[PDB]
């Protein structure tokens, strides 16, 4: 087992002298490694879930040893229901070791090879190498942990017991299963993406150079409807997308969404592409579409939140401050739980509606004055591989990115309001950051000329290097907005997958048709002016519902925070 050479992270080394940030970092390393080797917990919703689980375990371990005043542990040690009962410390008094035990046990439980009975799903089998690569990440982390790991300490053992409770309660090992799901083709209907209709996978994952079999992937079609939610207190729902159900009559909106999709999301060289070079950069910056050495969007959102956390920390000392430890333990629990539930509800809605992606909608439109049967997108970047850009293997509405960003950045806003500045709950903040680099645009990662070599550093492999782009942002509101519209620029989402067009685009005197510049490129409202307020109807449910991923994530974050981070009541979990 030759270890994957992981490239340098653009972050100050001082961050990992904090033990809360250190274990977050280990979680992110496992995220990017698992997406390089084909391990467990791949894909956006489940990778979010792993981080939520990590940070809940860290949170309750830490706050058992260091009791907070403004909130409580997520689980109570006094609960009668065994499944929800937090272990007691019984003399254990070392928070650093409690956190190490919780983090290590949780991450080992999540990423280790399952023992006996051969727990492996046919078509979703994981190689021995993949588990070994992840094991090495964990082993290396033990030696790097600031202040060390003492496995014999009572506090460490207490942390492990905390992890065991959370793992038993919240793990969903087969949550991403696709057994029995099949597309139902037709107008507006999700189906195999035409540039990647089938993939060849090894018959035996431990013989990768051996015989192959075709596979049609559908990412987690049952997860949203069946999995246990973390901290939400209701079910969340979106308006019918234009073209479907109660909004089947929104023809002007749908037709203009097609026009905008072509102009803003097409391949670089197409005569019909009106996107600017800067908008390409905005598209790629936020991608993290499961690529080698990069992982999934929750990894990027955590990288950003680490910078926010250190920028706005209350004490200078990252190593020896209980104020900083408590601050980070609480923030990352709030953020990664919100990211988890955002994954659940975005997936639930995605598979409820089964709305097609722009590539298929544009190609299969069927009307000469609207469609283009030969259109190509900029696409989800296939970074650190020789593969062509793609369409993520799940339905369009709402965008996962949009929802995750809504939840993560609204949570950051609720947490820091009063501290960094003051704003109304739904208005722009001043949580600015600088020197923020995306691994999609870092001067190191690349579009390779040949298949990725997992035994060599990325810099030693021929390819076209991604330009290094160092960013500043004014606010979490800006982060949330740009993250959402990035997907329009890639051509992987409709405008309404992000938010109501009315809330992000500039209107004209024609209803549902939005402004373009002299070249036909879409104009956006200024960040300071953006309000996610525009609602729509549902065929199956009375009332007014948000449109697209951003307001879905916002509402999830607000509900979680308003309830002080407490578990979803057992009685409202899915049962069926
Ligand atoms: O759901 P999406 O942002 O590819």
Coordinates of C-alpha atoms and ligand atoms in Angstrom, one line a residue:
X1 CA 0.0 0.0 0.0
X2 CA 1.8 3.1 -1.4
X3 CA 0.4 6.1 0.3
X4 CA -1.4 8.8 -1.8
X5 CA 0.9 11.9 -1.9
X6 CA -1.4 14.7 -0.7
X7 CA -0.7 18.2 -1.9
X8 CA -0.1 21.2 0.4
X9 CA -3.1 22.9 1.8
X10 CA -3.2 26.7 1.5
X11 CA -3.8 27.5 5.1
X12 CA -1.5 28.9 7.8
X13 CA 0.2 26.1 9.8
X14 CA -0.8 27.7 13.1
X15 CA -4.4 26.6 12.6
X16 CA -3.6 22.9 13.4
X17 CA -2.0 23.9 16.7
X18 CA -5.6 24.1 17.9
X19 CA -6.9 20.6 18.7
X20 CA -10.5 21.3 17.6
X21 CA -9.2 22.6 14.2
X22 CA -6.8 19.7 14.1
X23 CA -9.5 17.0 14.2
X24 CA -11.6 19.0 11.7
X25 CA -8.6 18.9 9.4
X26 CA -8.3 15.1 9.8
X27 CA -12.0 14.8 8.8
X28 CA -11.3 16.9 5.7
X29 CA -8.2 14.8 4.8
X30 CA -10.4 11.6 5.0
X31 CA -12.9 13.4 2.8
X32 CA -10.4 14.1 0.0
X33 CA -8.7 10.7 0.3
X34 CA -11.9 8.7 0.1
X35 CA -12.8 10.6 -3.1
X36 CA -9.4 9.7 -4.5
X37 CA -9.4 6.0 -3.7
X38 CA -13.1 5.1 -3.9
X39 CA -13.8 4.6 -0.2
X40 CA -16.8 5.0 2.1
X41 CA -18.9 8.1 2.6
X42 CA -18.4 9.5 -0.9
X43 CA -20.7 12.1 -2.5
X44 CA -22.1 15.3 -1.2
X45 CA -24.8 14.4 1.3
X46 CA -23.0 11.5 3.0
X47 CA -19.7 13.3 3.1
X48 CA -21.6 16.2 4.9
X49 CA -23.1 13.6 7.3
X50 CA -19.6 12.3 8.3
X51 CA -18.5 15.8 9.3
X52 CA -21.7 16.4 11.2
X53 CA -21.1 13.2 13.1
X54 CA -17.5 14.0 13.8
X55 CA -18.4 17.5 15.2
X56 CA -21.3 16.3 17.3
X57 CA -19.0 13.8 19.0
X58 CA -16.3 16.4 19.5
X59 CA -18.9 18.9 20.8
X60 CA -20.5 16.6 23.4
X61 CA -17.1 15.2 24.5
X62 CA -15.7 18.7 25.0
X63 CA -18.8 20.3 26.6
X64 CA -19.2 17.4 29.0
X65 CA -15.7 18.2 30.4
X66 CA -16.1 22.0 30.0
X67 CA -19.8 22.8 30.6
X68 CA -21.2 25.7 28.7
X69 CA -23.7 28.3 30.0
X70 CA -25.5 29.5 26.9
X71 CA -26.4 26.1 25.5
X72 CA -26.2 22.4 26.5
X73 CA -24.8 19.2 25.1
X74 CA -26.7 17.9 22.1
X75 CA -27.4 14.6 24.0
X76 CA -28.2 14.5 27.7
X77 CA -26.6 12.2 30.2
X78 CA -29.9 11.9 32.0
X79 CA -32.1 10.7 29.1
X80 CA -34.0 7.4 29.7
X81 CA -33.9 6.4 26.1
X82 CA -30.6 4.5 25.8
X83 CA -30.0 5.5 22.2
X84 CA -30.0 9.2 23.1
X85 CA -28.1 8.9 26.4
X86 CA -24.8 10.7 26.6
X87 CA -22.1 8.8 28.7
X88 CA -21.0 10.5 31.9
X89 CA -17.3 11.5 32.4
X90 CA -17.1 10.1 36.0
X91 CA -13.9 11.9 37.0
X92 CA -12.5 12.3 33.5
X93 CA -11.2 15.9 33.3
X94 CA -8.9 16.2 30.2
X95 CA -10.8 17.9 27.3
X96 CA -7.9 17.5 24.8
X97 CA -8.0 13.7 25.3
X98 CA -11.8 13.6 25.4
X99 CA -11.9 15.3 22.0
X100 CA -9.1 13.0 20.6
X101 CA -11.0 9.9 21.7
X102 CA -14.3 11.1 20.3
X103 CA -12.7 12.2 17.0
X104 CA -10.6 9.1 16.5
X105 CA -13.3 6.6 17.4
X106 CA -15.9 8.4 15.3
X107 CA -13.6 8.6 12.2
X108 CA -12.3 5.1 12.6
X109 CA -15.9 3.8 12.9
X110 CA -16.9 5.8 9.8
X111 CA -13.9 4.9 7.6
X112 CA -12.6 1.5 8.7
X113 CA -13.2 -1.8 6.8
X114 CA -16.4 -3.5 8.2
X115 CA -15.6 -6.7 10.1
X116 CA -17.1 -10.1 9.3
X117 CA -20.3 -11.2 7.5
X118 CA -18.6 -9.5 4.5
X119 CA -20.5 -6.2 4.7
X120 CA -20.2 -5.1 1.1
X121 CA -22.8 -4.0 -1.4
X122 CA -22.8 -5.4 -4.9
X123 CA -21.7 -2.6 -7.3
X124 CA -20.7 -0.5 -4.3
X125 CA -17.8 -2.7 -3.1
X126 CA -14.8 -0.9 -1.6
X127 CA -11.2 -2.1 -2.2
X128 CA -8.9 -3.2 0.5
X129 CA -6.5 -0.5 -0.8
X130 CA -9.1 2.2 -0.2
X131 CA -9.6 1.2 3.5
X132 CA -5.8 0.9 3.9
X133 CA -5.2 4.4 2.5
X134 CA -7.8 5.8 4.9
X135 CA -6.2 3.9 7.8
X136 CA -2.9 5.5 7.0
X137 CA -4.5 9.0 7.2
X138 CA -5.8 8.1 10.7
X139 CA -2.5 6.6 11.9
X140 CA -0.6 9.6 10.7
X141 CA -3.0 11.9 12.4
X142 CA -2.4 10.3 15.8
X143 CA 1.3 11.2 15.6
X144 CA 0.5 14.8 14.5
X145 CA -2.2 15.6 17.0
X146 CA -1.2 18.7 19.1
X147 CA -0.3 17.6 22.6
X148 CA -0.4 14.0 21.6
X149 CA -2.9 11.1 22.0
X150 CA -3.0 9.1 25.2
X151 CA -5.2 6.0 24.5
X152 CA -4.9 4.8 28.1
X153 CA -6.3 8.0 29.7
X154 CA -9.8 8.0 31.2
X155 CA -10.7 11.1 29.2
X156 CA -9.8 9.4 25.9
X157 CA -11.9 6.4 26.8
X158 CA -14.8 8.7 27.7
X159 CA -14.5 10.4 24.3
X160 CA -14.6 7.0 22.5
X161 CA -17.8 6.1 24.5
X162 CA -19.4 9.4 23.3
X163 CA -18.4 8.6 19.7
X164 CA -20.0 5.1 20.1
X165 CA -23.3 6.6 21.1
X166 CA -23.4 9.0 18.1
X167 CA -22.2 6.4 15.7
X168 CA -24.9 3.9 16.7
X169 CA -27.6 6.6 16.6
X170 CA -26.7 8.5 13.4
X171 CA -24.7 6.2 11.1
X172 CA -26.6 5.3 7.9
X173 CA -24.2 2.7 6.3
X174 CA -26.5 1.8 3.3
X175 CA -28.1 5.3 3.1
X176 CA -26.8 5.9 -0.4
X177 CA -28.1 2.7 -1.9
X178 CA -29.6 2.8 -5.3
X179 CA -31.2 -0.7 -5.5
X180 CA -34.5 -0.6 -7.2
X181 CA -34.3 3.0 -8.5
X182 CA -34.9 3.6 -12.3
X183 CA -35.4 6.8 -14.2
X184 CA -38.8 7.5 -15.9
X185 CA -37.8 9.4 -19.1
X186 CA -39.8 12.2 -20.5
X187 CA -39.9 16.0 -20.6
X188 CA -38.3 17.5 -17.5
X189 CA -37.3 14.0 -16.3
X190 CA -33.9 13.1 -14.9
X191 CA -32.1 10.2 -16.7
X192 CA -28.5 9.1 -17.5
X193 CA -26.5 12.2 -18.5
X194 CA -25.8 12.0 -22.2
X195 CA -22.0 12.7 -21.9
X196 CA -21.6 10.0 -19.3
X197 CA -24.5 7.5 -19.8
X198 CA -22.6 4.5 -18.4
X199 CA -19.3 3.8 -16.6
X200 CA -17.1 0.6 -16.6
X201 CA -16.2 -0.5 -13.1
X202 CA -14.1 -3.5 -12.0
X203 CA -16.1 -6.7 -11.4
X204 CA -13.7 -7.2 -8.4
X205 CA -12.6 -3.9 -6.7
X206 CA -9.4 -5.7 -5.6
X207 CA -8.6 -6.5 -9.2
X208 CA -8.9 -3.0 -10.8
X209 CA -6.8 -3.9 -13.9
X210 CA -9.0 -7.0 -14.4
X211 CA -12.5 -7.5 -16.0
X212 CA -15.0 -4.7 -16.1
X213 CA -18.8 -4.4 -16.0
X214 CA -21.1 -1.6 -17.0
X215 CA -22.7 0.5 -14.3
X216 CA -25.3 3.2 -14.3
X217 CA -24.9 5.3 -11.1
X218 CA -27.8 7.1 -9.4
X219 CA -26.5 9.0 -6.3
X220 CA -28.5 8.3 -3.1
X221 CA -32.1 8.3 -4.5
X222 CA -33.7 7.1 -1.1
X223 CA -31.4 8.9 1.4
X224 CA -33.4 12.1 1.8
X225 CA -36.7 10.3 2.4
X226 CA -35.5 7.5 4.7
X227 CA -32.5 8.8 6.8
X228 CA -32.5 10.1 10.3
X229 CA -32.3 13.9 10.3
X230 CA -29.9 15.5 12.8
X231 CA -31.2 18.8 14.3
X232 CA -34.1 19.9 12.1
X233 CA -37.5 20.1 13.8
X234 CA -39.8 19.8 10.8
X235 CA -39.8 18.6 7.2
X236 CA -38.7 21.2 4.6
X237 CA -40.2 21.6 1.1
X238 CA -39.6 23.7 -2.0
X239 CA -42.0 25.1 -4.6
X240 CA -42.6 23.1 -7.8
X241 CA -39.9 24.0 -10.3
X242 CA -41.0 25.8 -13.5
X243 CA -42.5 23.2 -15.9
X244 CA -43.7 20.8 -13.2
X245 CA -47.0 20.2 -11.4
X246 CA -48.6 23.5 -10.1
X247 CA -46.0 25.5 -12.1
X248 CA -46.3 23.6 -15.4
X249 CA -47.7 26.9 -16.7
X250 CA -44.5 28.9 -16.0
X251 CA -43.5 28.7 -19.6
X252 CA -41.9 32.2 -19.9
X253 CA -39.7 31.4 -16.9
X254 CA -38.7 28.0 -18.2
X255 CA -38.0 29.2 -21.7
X256 CA -35.9 32.1 -20.4
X257 CA -34.1 29.7 -18.1
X258 CA -33.1 27.6 -21.2
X259 CA -31.8 30.7 -22.9
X260 CA -29.8 31.8 -19.9
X261 CA -28.5 28.2 -19.4
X262 CA -27.1 28.1 -22.9
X263 CA -25.5 31.6 -22.8
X264 CA -24.0 31.3 -19.3
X265 CA -23.2 27.7 -18.9
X266 CA -21.9 26.5 -22.3
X267 CA -18.4 25.2 -23.2
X268 CA -15.7 27.8 -23.6
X269 CA -15.4 27.6 -27.3
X270 CA -19.1 27.6 -28.3
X271 CA -20.3 30.6 -30.3
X272 CA -23.4 30.6 -28.1
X273 CA -21.4 31.0 -24.8
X274 CA -21.5 34.5 -23.5
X275 CA -20.0 33.8 -20.0
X276 CA -16.9 36.0 -19.2
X277 CA -13.5 34.6 -18.1
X278 CA -14.1 35.9 -14.6
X279 CA -17.5 34.1 -14.5
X280 CA -15.7 30.8 -15.5
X281 CA -13.4 31.4 -12.5
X282 CA -16.5 31.9 -10.3
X283 CA -17.9 28.6 -11.7
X284 CA -14.8 26.6 -11.0
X285 CA -13.9 28.2 -7.6
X286 CA -16.8 26.5 -5.9
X287 CA -16.9 23.2 -7.6
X288 CA -15.3 20.4 -5.5
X289 CA -17.3 17.9 -7.4
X290 CA -15.7 14.8 -5.9
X291 CA -12.3 15.1 -7.6
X292 CA -9.1 13.4 -6.8
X293 CA -7.2 15.1 -4.0
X294 CA -10.1 17.5 -3.6
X295 CA -13.2 15.8 -2.4
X296 CA -16.7 17.3 -2.1
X297 CA -18.3 20.7 -1.4
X298 CA -18.6 20.2 2.4
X299 CA -14.7 20.0 2.4
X300 CA -14.5 23.5 0.7
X301 CA -17.2 25.0 3.0
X302 CA -15.2 23.7 6.0
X303 CA -11.9 25.2 4.6
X304 CA -13.7 28.6 4.4
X305 CA -15.2 28.3 7.9
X306 CA -11.8 27.5 9.3
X307 CA -10.6 30.8 7.9
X308 CA -13.6 32.6 9.3
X309 CA -13.1 31.0 12.7
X310 CA -9.4 32.0 13.0
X311 CA -10.0 35.5 11.6
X312 CA -12.7 36.3 14.2
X313 CA -11.4 34.3 17.2
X314 CA -11.6 36.1 20.6
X315 CA -8.0 35.2 21.7
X316 CA -4.7 35.2 19.9
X317 CA -3.4 31.9 21.3
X318 CA -4.6 29.1 19.1
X319 CA -3.0 26.4 21.2
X320 CA -3.8 27.2 24.8
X321 CA -7.1 29.1 24.8
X322 CA -10.2 27.5 26.3
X323 CA -12.2 30.4 24.8
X324 CA -11.0 29.4 21.4
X325 CA -11.5 25.7 21.9
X326 CA -15.1 26.3 23.0
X327 CA -15.7 28.8 20.2
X328 CA -14.5 26.3 17.5
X329 CA -16.2 23.2 19.1
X330 CA -19.5 25.0 19.0
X331 CA -19.2 26.7 15.6
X332 CA -18.2 23.5 13.8
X333 CA -21.0 21.5 15.4
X334 CA -23.5 24.1 14.3
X335 CA -22.1 24.4 10.8
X336 CA -21.6 20.7 10.0
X337 CA -24.9 19.7 11.5
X338 CA -26.5 22.3 9.3
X339 CA -24.5 21.1 6.3
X340 CA -25.8 17.5 7.1
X341 CA -29.4 18.4 7.2
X342 CA -29.0 20.6 4.1
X343 CA -27.7 17.5 2.3
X344 CA -30.7 15.5 3.6
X345 CA -33.4 17.9 2.4
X346 CA -31.8 18.9 -0.9
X347 CA -31.5 15.2 -1.7
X348 CA -35.0 14.6 -0.6
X349 CA -36.3 17.3 -2.9
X350 CA -34.0 16.3 -5.8
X351 CA -35.4 12.8 -5.9
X352 CA -39.0 13.9 -5.3
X353 CA -39.0 16.1 -8.4
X354 CA -36.5 14.2 -10.5
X355 CA -36.0 17.4 -12.6
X356 CA -33.6 17.1 -15.5
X357 CA -30.2 18.9 -15.7
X358 CA -29.6 21.7 -18.2
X359 CA -27.5 19.5 -20.5
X360 CA -30.5 17.2 -21.0
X361 CA -33.1 19.9 -21.0
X362 CA -31.3 21.9 -23.7
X363 CA -30.5 18.9 -25.8
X364 CA -33.9 17.2 -25.5
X365 CA -36.0 20.3 -25.6
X366 CA -37.2 19.4 -29.1
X367 CA -38.2 22.9 -30.3
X368 CA -35.8 24.4 -33.0
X369 CA -36.2 28.0 -31.7
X370 CA -35.3 27.0 -28.1
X371 CA -33.2 23.8 -27.9
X372 CA -29.7 22.7 -29.0
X373 CA -29.4 18.9 -29.5
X374 CA -25.6 19.2 -29.6
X375 CA -25.0 21.6 -26.7
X376 CA -22.0 21.2 -24.4
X377 CA -21.5 22.6 -20.9
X378 CA -18.5 24.0 -19.2
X379 CA -19.3 21.2 -16.7
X380 CA -18.4 20.0 -13.3
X381 CA -14.6 20.1 -13.5
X382 CA -12.9 16.7 -13.6
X383 CA -9.9 17.9 -11.7
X384 CA -6.7 15.8 -11.3
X385 CA -7.9 13.3 -13.9
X386 CA -7.8 13.0 -17.7
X387 CA -11.6 12.7 -17.8
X388 CA -13.9 15.2 -19.5
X389 CA -16.1 17.5 -17.4
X390 CA -19.4 16.0 -16.4
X391 CA -22.9 16.2 -14.9
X392 CA -23.2 15.1 -11.2
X393 CA -25.3 11.8 -11.3
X394 CA -28.5 13.1 -9.6
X395 CA -31.4 15.4 -10.4
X396 CA -31.2 19.2 -10.7
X397 CA -33.8 20.8 -8.5
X398 CA -32.6 22.2 -6.0
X399 CA -28.9 22.6 -6.3
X400 CA -26.9 20.8 -3.6
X401 CA -24.2 23.5 -3.6
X402 CA -26.9 26.2 -3.3
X403 CA -28.5 24.4 -0.3
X404 CA -25.3 23.5 1.5
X405 CA -24.1 27.1 1.1
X406 CA -27.4 28.5 2.3
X407 CA -27.2 26.4 5.4
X408 CA -23.5 26.8 6.2
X409 CA -23.3 30.5 5.6
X410 CA -26.6 31.3 7.2
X411 CA -25.4 29.4 10.2
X412 CA -22.1 31.4 10.3
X413 CA -24.3 34.6 10.1
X414 CA -26.5 33.5 13.0
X415 CA -23.5 32.6 15.1
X416 CA -21.5 35.8 14.5
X417 CA -24.3 38.3 14.5
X418 CA -23.5 40.9 17.3
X419 CA -19.9 39.8 17.4
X420 CA -18.4 40.7 14.0
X421 CA -21.1 43.3 13.3
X422 CA -24.9 43.7 13.4
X423 CA -27.4 42.9 10.7
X424 CA -31.0 41.8 10.4
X425 CA -31.3 38.0 10.2
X426 CA -32.0 38.1 6.5
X427 CA -29.8 41.1 5.4
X428 CA -26.1 41.3 4.4
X429 CA -23.4 40.8 7.1
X430 CA -19.8 42.0 7.3
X431 CA -18.0 38.7 7.9
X432 CA -15.2 39.5 5.4
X433 CA -12.2 37.2 4.7
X434 CA -9.0 37.5 2.6
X435 CA -6.4 35.2 1.1
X436 CA -9.0 32.5 0.4
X437 CA -7.9 30.0 -2.2
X438 CA -9.9 27.2 -3.8
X439 CA -8.1 24.0 -4.7
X440 CA -9.9 24.2 -8.1
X441 CA -7.8 27.3 -8.9
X442 CA -4.6 27.1 -6.9
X443 CA -1.7 26.9 -9.3
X444 CA -1.1 23.2 -8.5
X445 CA -4.1 21.1 -9.4
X446 CA -4.6 20.3 -13.0
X447 CA -6.4 18.8 -15.9
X448 CA -4.2 15.7 -16.6
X449 CA -2.9 14.4 -20.0
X450 CA -3.1 10.8 -18.8
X451 CA -4.9 8.9 -15.9
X452 CA -4.1 10.1 -12.4
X453 CA -1.1 8.3 -10.8
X454 CA -1.9 7.6 -7.1
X455 CA 1.8 6.9 -6.4
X456 CA 3.1 10.4 -7.4
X457 CA 2.6 14.0 -6.3
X458 CA 0.2 15.9 -8.5
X459 CA 3.0 18.4 -9.5
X460 CA 5.0 15.5 -11.0
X461 CA 2.1 14.6 -13.4
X462 CA 1.7 16.3 -16.9
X463 CA -1.4 18.4 -17.3
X464 CA -2.7 21.9 -17.7
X465 CA -2.3 23.8 -14.4
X466 CA -5.3 25.7 -12.9
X467 CA -4.6 29.4 -12.5
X468 CA -4.0 30.5 -8.9
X469 CA -6.7 32.9 -7.9
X470 CA -6.5 34.5 -4.4
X471 CA -9.9 35.8 -3.3
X472 CA -11.3 38.3 -0.8
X473 CA -15.0 38.3 0.2
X474 CA -17.0 41.1 1.9
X475 CA -19.5 38.9 3.6
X476 CA -21.0 35.5 4.2
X477 CA -23.9 36.8 2.1
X478 CA -21.5 37.1 -0.8
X479 CA -20.0 33.6 -0.2
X480 CA -23.6 32.2 -0.3
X481 CA -24.5 34.0 -3.4
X482 CA -21.4 33.3 -5.5
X483 CA -21.4 29.6 -4.4
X484 CA -25.0 29.3 -5.7
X485 CA -24.5 31.1 -9.0
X486 CA -21.3 29.2 -9.7
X487 CA -23.5 26.3 -10.9
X488 CA -25.2 28.5 -13.5
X489 CA -21.7 29.3 -14.9
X490 CA -20.8 25.6 -15.1
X491 CA -24.0 24.8 -16.9
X492 CA -24.9 22.1 -14.4
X493 CA -28.0 24.0 -12.9
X494 CA -31.0 26.0 -13.9
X495 CA -31.2 29.5 -12.5
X496 CA -34.1 28.4 -10.3
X497 CA -32.1 25.5 -8.8
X498 CA -30.2 28.2 -6.9
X499 CA -32.9 30.7 -6.0
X500 CA -35.9 32.4 -7.5
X501 CA -34.7 34.2 -10.7
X502 CA -36.6 37.2 -9.4
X503 CA -34.3 37.4 -6.3
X504 CA -31.0 37.2 -8.1
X505 CA -31.4 38.6 -11.7
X506 CA -32.3 42.1 -13.0
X507 CA -35.9 42.4 -14.3
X508 CA -37.1 43.8 -17.6
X509 CA -40.6 45.0 -18.7
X510 CA -41.2 41.4 -19.9
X511 CA -42.4 39.1 -17.1
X512 CA -39.9 36.3 -16.2
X513 CA -37.4 37.5 -18.8
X514 CA -34.3 39.0 -17.2
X515 CA -31.8 41.6 -18.3
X516 CA -28.7 40.9 -20.4
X517 CA -25.8 43.1 -21.4
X518 CA -24.8 44.1 -25.0
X519 CA -23.3 40.6 -25.6
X520 CA -26.3 38.7 -24.3
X521 CA -24.7 37.8 -20.9
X522 CA -27.0 37.7 -17.8
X523 CA -26.7 40.6 -15.4
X524 CA -27.1 40.0 -11.6
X525 CA -28.5 42.1 -8.7
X526 CA -25.9 43.5 -6.4
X527 CA -25.1 41.3 -3.4
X528 CA -26.1 44.1 -1.0
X529 CA -29.6 44.2 -2.6
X530 CA -30.3 40.4 -2.7
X531 CA -33.2 39.0 -0.6
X532 CA -34.4 35.5 -0.9
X533 CA -38.1 36.2 -0.6
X534 CA -39.9 35.0 -3.7
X535 CA -42.2 32.1 -3.0
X536 CA -44.1 29.6 -5.2
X537 CA -46.8 27.0 -5.0
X538 CA -46.8 23.1 -4.7
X539 CA -49.4 20.8 -6.2
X540 CA -49.3 18.4 -3.3
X541 CA -49.2 20.9 -0.4
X542 CA -51.1 24.1 0.5
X543 CA -49.2 27.4 1.1
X544 CA -46.2 29.3 0.0
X545 CA -42.7 27.6 -0.4
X546 CA -39.2 28.9 -1.2
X547 CA -37.7 28.4 -4.6
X548 CA -34.3 26.8 -5.1
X549 CA -31.5 25.7 -2.8
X550 CA -30.3 28.9 -1.1
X551 CA -33.5 29.7 0.8
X552 CA -33.9 26.0 1.6
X553 CA -30.5 26.0 3.3
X554 CA -31.2 29.3 5.0
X555 CA -34.4 28.0 6.6
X556 CA -32.7 24.8 7.8
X557 CA -29.9 26.8 9.4
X558 CA -32.4 29.2 11.1
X559 CA -34.5 26.3 12.5
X560 CA -31.5 24.5 13.8
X561 CA -30.0 27.6 15.5
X562 CA -33.4 28.8 16.9
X563 CA -33.7 25.4 18.7
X564 CA -30.2 25.7 20.2
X565 CA -28.9 22.6 18.4
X566 CA -31.0 19.8 19.7
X567 CA -31.9 16.4 18.1
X568 CA -34.7 15.9 15.7
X569 CA -37.5 14.4 17.9
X570 CA -37.6 10.6 17.4
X571 CA -41.3 10.7 16.6
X572 CA -40.8 12.9 13.5
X573 CA -38.0 10.8 12.0
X574 CA -38.9 8.9 8.8
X575 CA -40.5 5.5 9.6
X576 CA -42.7 4.2 6.7
Ligands
LIG1 O1 -26.9 19.9 -7.2 P1 -25.7 20.6 -7.8 O2 -25.2 21.9 -7.2 O3 -24.8 19.9 -8.8

